[PDB]
Amino acid sequence: TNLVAEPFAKLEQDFGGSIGVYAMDTGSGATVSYRAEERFPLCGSFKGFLAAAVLARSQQQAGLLDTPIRYGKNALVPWSPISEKYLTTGMTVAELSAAAVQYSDNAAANLLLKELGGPAGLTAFMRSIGDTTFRLDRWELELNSAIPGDARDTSSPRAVTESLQKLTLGSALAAPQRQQFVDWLKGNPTGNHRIRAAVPADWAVGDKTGTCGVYGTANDYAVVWPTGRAPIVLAVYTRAPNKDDKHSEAVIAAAARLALEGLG
Ligand SMILES: C[C@@H](O)[C@@H](C(=O)O)[C@H]1CC(SCCNC=N)=C(C(=O)O)N1
């Protein structure tokens, strides 16, 4: 594990913070781990799991995805580029889910959390798939505080990867819901400088990013489909000790590359 770990330790030292990585080859079972059981703030990366929770609920409530959500101005919070434009009409649950995943829309995220019973409702969904590490405690935008030591609104790289595998490739979602989730991740345009930058252009990638805006705290998780080979699932999370420390997309891409090249 010393030969595996040492390039990650070098990377996080030059970054000035901590990096957590977990990658799984779903065919052979091979893994790469670095700080994989440490907690890191989720930031907006929870929004991918939120959409999966909504899709899962639609398996027990026919028509949930078509349900109209007609909201007022108070539902709007900072960084709500899609939901801001439909204030005059409303949006359906599926339209809000697409906005949360592909634009990281904060109002859409809060509206979907409300549908699920709050942050506790998303945590309960994650428990239902066997994830005991994930916890969402607060709403947007308070969940982005990323204060050193705080376990609220965190998970671990290993738990993120394991849950992502269950939702995108396992049995948790029925086929139509599973393909919708995969399509939302594949079409996400916010992560071009993160895990996607480490992956050959020929290979499809679906990802969800998070960027807290403080404490150098940012992340990405992804499924990678190498052509004619079993898919890979991976997660890369960062944090830093000072409130004004800057996050780095380049560090996330570099750590993704180190993990992908070390699988086998
Ligand atoms: C709301 C803010 O904290 C952040 C988050 O939820 O983590 C929003 C803003 C951003 S927009 C991405 C900007 N990309 C620049 N290259 C993200 C994200 O990384 O997905 N989500």
Ligand 1: which residue has its CA nearest to atom 18?
210
Residue 208 CA, closest ligand 1 atom number: 20
Is residue 252 a contact partner of residue 196, using CB atoms and an 8 Å limit? no
Positive or negative torsion for Cα 31, 34, 35, 39: negative
Burial label for 62, CB within 10 Å (0-12, 13-18, 19+), is exposed
Gap between the Cα atoms of 196 and 140, Å rounded:
26
State the resolution, in angstroms: 1.5
DSSP 247: P
Gap between the Cα atoms of 197 and 183, Å rounded:
19
Selection from 109, 96, 219 nearest residue 154 by Cα: 219
3-state secondary structure of 42: coil
Sheet holding 218-225, edge to edge: 31-34, 18-25, 232-239, 218-225, 204-211
The CATH fold assigned to 1-262 is: Beta-lactamase (3.40.710)
Strand pairing class (31-34; 232-239):
unpaired
Encode 196-218: b = buried (16+ Cβ within 10 Å), e = exposed: bbbbeeeeebbbbbbbbebbbbb
Is residue 226 a contact partner of residue 203, using CB atoms and an 8 Å limit? yes
* Ligand 1 pocket, CB under 6 A: 43-44, 79, 104, 106, 144, 190, 209-213
Question: ∠ CA 216-137-222 to the nearest 5 degrees?
Answer: 55
Q: Say which residues have a Cβ less than 8 Å from residue 103's Cβ, sequence separation at least 6.
A: 81, 82, 190
Gap between the Cα atoms of 99 and 151, Å rounded:
27
Chain breaks in the chain (C to N over 2.5 A) after: none
